[PDB]
RNA sequence: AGCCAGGAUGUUGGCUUAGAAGCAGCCAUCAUUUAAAGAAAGCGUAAUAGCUCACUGGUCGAGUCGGCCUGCGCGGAAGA
């Protein structure tokens, strides 16, 4: 995944979730979209 | 009117019957023939005329050849030899390019005895007006 | 809450036993017991279970709804039972079941004996098709994901163990 | 039609008008006519949404102060420099 | 890039940038990009952003720039003592107070203006905000 | 919000098209039948495509959507 300060929805299939204390992007349609550390 | 099982559409003109260069190998590659395209093809292609692009059904199950009942020609096929340019577009909307009219293509479209929508023939009338405008033409309606 | 508020109905002779936060739910096909949060309160009456917040707990409703939707599927459990099905894709990939064990042949040096737990059981219409069956929704869940784990579908062929409820997009390969 | 409630001003100066704005209110004034001008306080949230509609600035408004009906027109307004908020308003008795 | 074409003098005193801003109303177009913060803009900054907004509306509409350098900035370079005369100019900036309208635009759907004004902001050292035109 | 449906007609759209049939390209963005269906949303075929979508019927049955002013918090955060 990509990790950076500004994470974002990139597809309409992106989803933002918090897990532990950490902003993540789970896209159901494009592995490249997975982000962490927002 | 049932579901999926045989149909393509990739030709040039009733003039050419079965050709190899613009098409050829894939004019039959699954239950259809590169050789059979004058038999059911010219079962009424020459009887009437050879000079208007027309594609058709394929209907395939497992019976040797194929039962494709044929039908109509497009509406920009009648913009070369019944209305104007053989090519068309050019610079489609840099100016009016070419031009048609209401008389021009009324009967040329009113013909189809096997296609079009709505028994009102003032409606499917104009259904064809725009396939002379997908190229950017003027309205002398 | 839309979930928690929505009641759940204990069918024919499903015996239900609450003991504080401790629910038991037995029926035709098993018996499961769970422990509910604490900020959940559950009321048993008629042939229905209901759920609702508990005075002075922030998460009240959410805890209720998750509890709600759990007991529901506990009940489905001892009754219709759940069933996950996996199929095995790839030359040589076969599988079958000695007792409570599934013998998996998934291209490794050593085939794989996967032990089945508490309350799940399996069989194999085919050399290439596994089907788990049990009352515990969250356990056939794991087992399914575990048999899966041995060989997650790969993206250039779909070779691998997959749920049947699973689409497996594949891709090309880079040019040269 | 546009009805604006408003009590007159017990005090004046900046310390006083800053306090005013500190507690979601803001001051305005009324003048013209032969009357002495009247210093006022308007509630902020309410007059804000009024003026969002461009008839606020065109139409004659009716200011209600101590159960009396003053008819006026928006004459000027001072806006906070970068927040969407009013600082002060000039109403003209007309 | 912007900068005086000629100036009565070559260098200015450091100055101070206290204060609230003097051009606060979208007064030429339909939408301004306004400064919520205090600080300095540089001709390059003004410019980098200027391009950004123009990029975004292709060749449509009109744009104004309400701010402008005129304040020259010096710098001593490496390996130099303190002193021995004021530095050499090197760029120009425009002192910004909060509430300056920075850019205006007009001739586009409000939405696109936002879009452009957004992308431009990204190049500016100070926080900004999308304002609209007002009767009075 | 989910889920059952539909997703059309000129039109396989004219086109500097070798093949395009919505798709980097082509130009405009009109126009038939309907409950509504985009010369256009897409992962993307040798081209038919096969498959979900903007949009609309039904089902369900009471709330739902995100901008504004603000308090306190989260990430952004690597050294001997
Ligand atoms: Mg963890
Ligand atoms: Mg003071
Ligand atoms: Mg709905
Ligand atoms: Mg912080």
UniProtKB/Swiss-Prot annotation, chain A:
InterPro entries noted in UniProt: Ribosomal_bL36, Ribosomal_bL36_sp
Domain of life: Bacteria
Keyword check for Transferase: no
Keywords assigned: Ribonucleoprotein, Ribosomal protein, RNA-binding, rRNA-binding
GO BP term, pick one: translation
Keyword rRNA-binding: yes
Gene Ontology CC terms: cytoplasm; cytosolic large ribosomal subunit
GO MF term set: rRNA binding; structural constituent of ribosome
Function: One of the last ribosomal proteins to be assembled in the 50S subunit, it contacts a number of helices in the 23S rRNA, acting as molecular glue. The simultaneous presence of uL16 and bL36 probably triggers ObgE's GTPase activity and eventual dissociation from the mature 50S ribosomal subunit.
PANTHER family in UniProt: 50S RIBOSOMAL PROTEIN L36, CHLOROPLASTIC, LARGE RIBOSOMAL SUBUNIT PROTEIN BL36C
NCBIfam families cross-referenced by the UniProt entry: rpmJ_bact
SUBUNIT field: Part of the 50S ribosomal subunit.
HAMAP family cross-referenced by the UniProt entry: Ribosomal_bL36 (MF_00251)
Recorded family membership: Belongs to the bacterial ribosomal protein bL36 family.
Protein name as annotated: Large ribosomal subunit protein bL36A
Organism: Escherichia coli (strain K12)
Gene name per UniProt: rpmJ
Curated annotation (Swiss-Prot), chain B:
Domain of life: Bacteria
Name of the protein in its database record: Large ribosomal subunit protein uL11
In-chain residues carrying the UniProt-annotated modification N6-succinyllysine: 71, 80
Species whose genome carries this gene: Escherichia coli (strain K12)
UniProt xrefs under CDD domains: Ribosomal_L11
Family in the record: Belongs to the universal ribosomal protein uL11 family.
UniProt record, GO biological process: cytoplasmic translation; ribosomal large subunit assembly; stringent response; translation; translational termination
Residues with PTM N6,N6,N6-trimethyllysine: 3, 39
Any one annotated GO CC term: cytoplasm
Gene Ontology molecular function: any one: structural constituent of ribosome
Keywords: Methylation, Ribonucleoprotein, Ribosomal protein, RNA-binding, rRNA-binding
Function: Forms part of the ribosomal stalk which helps the ribosome interact with GTP-bound translation factors.
Annotated positions of the N,N,N-trimethylalanine modification: 1
Coiled-coil residue spans: none
SUPFAM superfamilies membership: Ribosomal L11/L12e N-terminal domain (SSF54747), Ribosomal protein L11, C-terminal domain (SSF46906)
Stored InterPro entries: Ribosomal_uL11, Ribosomal_uL11_bac-typ, Ribosomal_uL11_C, Ribosomal_uL11_C_sf, Ribosomal_uL11_CS, Ribosomal_uL11_N, Ribosomal_uL11_N_sf
SMART domains in alphabetical order: RL11
PANTHER family from the UniProt entry: 60S RIBOSOMAL PROTEIN L12, LARGE RIBOSOMAL SUBUNIT PROTEIN UL11M
Subunit annotation: Part of the ribosomal stalk of the 50S ribosomal subunit. Interacts with L10 and the large rRNA to form the base of the stalk. L10 forms an elongated spine to which 2 L12 dimers bind in a sequential fashion forming a pentameric L10(L12)2(L12)2 complex.
From Swiss-Prot, chain C:
Any one of the GO CC terms: cytoplasm
Keywords: Acetylation, Antibiotic resistance, Ribonucleoprotein, Ribosomal protein, RNA-binding, rRNA-binding
GO BP: any one term: response to antibiotic
PROSITE patterns xrefs: RIBOSOMAL_L6_1 (PS00525)
Positions of modified residues (N6-acetyllysine): 43
Gene3D superfamilies attached to this UniProt entry: Ribosomal protein L6, alpha-beta domain (3.90.930.12)
Keyword Zinc applies: no
InterPro entries: Ribosomal_uL6-like, Ribosomal_uL6-like_a/b-dom_sf, Ribosomal_uL6_a/b-dom, Ribosomal_uL6_bac-type, Ribosomal_uL6_CS
UniProt xrefs under Pfam families: Ribosomal_L6 (PF00347)
Sequence similarity: Belongs to the universal ribosomal protein uL6 family.
NCBIfam families found in the cross-reference section: L6_bact
Protein purpose: This protein binds directly to at least 2 domains of the 23S ribosomal RNA, thus is important in its secondary structure. It is located near the subunit interface in the base of the L7/L12 stalk, and near the tRNA binding site of the peptidyltransferase center. Gentamicin-resistant mutations in this protein affect translation fidelity.
PANTHER family reported for this sequence: 60S/50S RIBOSOMAL PROTEIN L6/L9, LARGE RIBOSOMAL SUBUNIT PROTEIN UL6M
Subunit and interaction comment: Part of the 50S ribosomal subunit.
Protein name: Large ribosomal subunit protein uL6
The species this protein was found in: Escherichia coli (strain K12)
UniProtKB/Swiss-Prot annotation, chain D:
Key words, A-Z: Ribonucleoprotein, Ribosomal protein, RNA-binding, rRNA-binding
Keyword Membrane among record annotations: no
Entry coiled-coil feature ranges: none
Single annotated GO MF: structural constituent of ribosome
GO cellular component: cytoplasm; cytosol; cytosolic large ribosomal subunit
A biological-process GO annotation: ribosomal large subunit assembly
Self-association and partners: Part of the 50S ribosomal subunit; part of the 5S rRNA/L5/L18/L25 subcomplex. Contacts the 5S rRNA.
Reported function: This is one of the proteins that binds to the 5S RNA in the ribosome where it forms part of the central protuberance. Binds to the 5S rRNA independently of L5 and L18. Not required for binding of the 5S rRNA/L5/L18 subcomplex to 23S rRNA.
Recorded family membership: Belongs to the bacterial ribosomal protein bL25 family.
Protein name per the record: Large ribosomal subunit protein bL25
Organismal lineage: Bacteria, Pseudomonadati, Pseudomonadota, Gammaproteobacteria, Enterobacterales
């Amino acid at each position: 995944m990509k990790v950076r300060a500004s994470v974002k929805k990139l597809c309409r299939n992106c989803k933002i979730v918090k897990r532990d204390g950490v902003i993540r992007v789970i896209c159901s349609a494009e592995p490249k979209h997975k982000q962490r550390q927002g | 009117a049932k579901k999926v099982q045989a149909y393509v559409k990739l030709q040039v003109a009733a003039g050419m019957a079965n050709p190899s260069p613009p098409v050829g190998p894939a004019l039959g590659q699954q239950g259809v023939n590169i050789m059979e395209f004058c038999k059911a093809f010219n079962a009424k292609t020459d009887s009437i005329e050879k000079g208007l692009p027309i594609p058709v059904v394929i209907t395939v199950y497992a019976d040797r050849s194929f039962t494709f009942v044929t039908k109509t020609p497009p509406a920009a096929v009648l913009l070369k030899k019944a209305a104007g340019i053989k090519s068309g577009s050019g610079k489609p909307n840099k100016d009016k390019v070419g031009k048609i009219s209401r008389a021009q293509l009324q009967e040329i479209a009113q013909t189809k005895a096997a296609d079009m929508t709505g028994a009102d023939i003032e409606a499917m009338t104009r259904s064809i007006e725009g396939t002379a405008r997908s190229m950017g033409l003027v309205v002398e309606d | 809450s839309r979930v928690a508020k929505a009641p759940v109905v204990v069918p024919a002779g499903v015996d239900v036993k609450i003991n504080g936060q401790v629910i038991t739910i037995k029926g035709k096909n098993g018996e499961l017991t769970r422990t509910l949060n604490d900020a959940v309160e559950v009321k048993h009456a008629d042939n229905t279970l209901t759920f609702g917040p508990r005075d002075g707990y922030a998460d009240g409703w959410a805890q209720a709804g998750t509890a709600r939707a759990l007991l529901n599927s506990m009940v489905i459990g001892v009754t219709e039972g759940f069933t996950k099905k996996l199929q095995l894709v790839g030359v040589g990939y076969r599988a079958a079941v000695k007792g409570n064990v599934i013998n998996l042949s998934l291209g490794f040096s050593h085939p794989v004996d996967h032990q089945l737990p508490a309350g799940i059981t399996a069989e194999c219409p085919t050399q290439t098709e596994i089907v788990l069956k049990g009352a515990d929704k969250q356990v056939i869940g794991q087992v399914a994901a575990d048999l899966r784990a041995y060989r997650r579908p790969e993206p250039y062929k779909g070779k691998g163990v997959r749920y049947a409820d699973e689409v497996v997009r594949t891709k090309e390969a880079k040019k040269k | 039609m546009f009805t604006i409630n408003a009590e007159v001003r017990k005090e004046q100066g900046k310390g006083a008008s800053r306090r005013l704005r500190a507690a979601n209110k803001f001051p305005a004034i009324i003048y013209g006519g032969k009357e002495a001008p009247l210093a006022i306080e308007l509630d902020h949230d309410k007059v804000m949404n009024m003026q969002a509609k461009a008839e606020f600035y065109s139409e004659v408004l009716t200011i209600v102060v101590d159960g009396k009906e003053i008819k006026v027109k928006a004459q000027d307004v001072q806006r906070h420099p970068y927040k969407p908020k009013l600082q002060h308003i000039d109403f003209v008795r007309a | 890039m912007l900068q005086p074409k000629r100036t009565k003098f070559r260098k200015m005193h450091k100055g101070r940038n206290r204060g609230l801003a003097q051009g606060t109303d979208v007064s030429f177009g339909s939408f301004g990009l306004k400064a919520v913060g205090r600080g300095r803009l540089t001709a390059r900054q003004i410019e980098a952003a200027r391009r950004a907004m123009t990029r975004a509306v292709k060749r449509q509409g009109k744009i104004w720039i309400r701010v402008f350098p005129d304040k020259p900035i010096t710098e001593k370079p490496l390996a130099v003592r303190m002193g021995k005369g004021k530095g050499n100019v090197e760029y120009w900036v425009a002192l910004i107070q909060p509430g300056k309208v920075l850019y205006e635009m007009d001739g586009v759907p409000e939405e696109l203006a936002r879009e452009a004004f957004k992308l431009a902001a990204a190049k500016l050292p100070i926080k900004t905000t999308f304002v609209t035109k007002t009767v009075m």
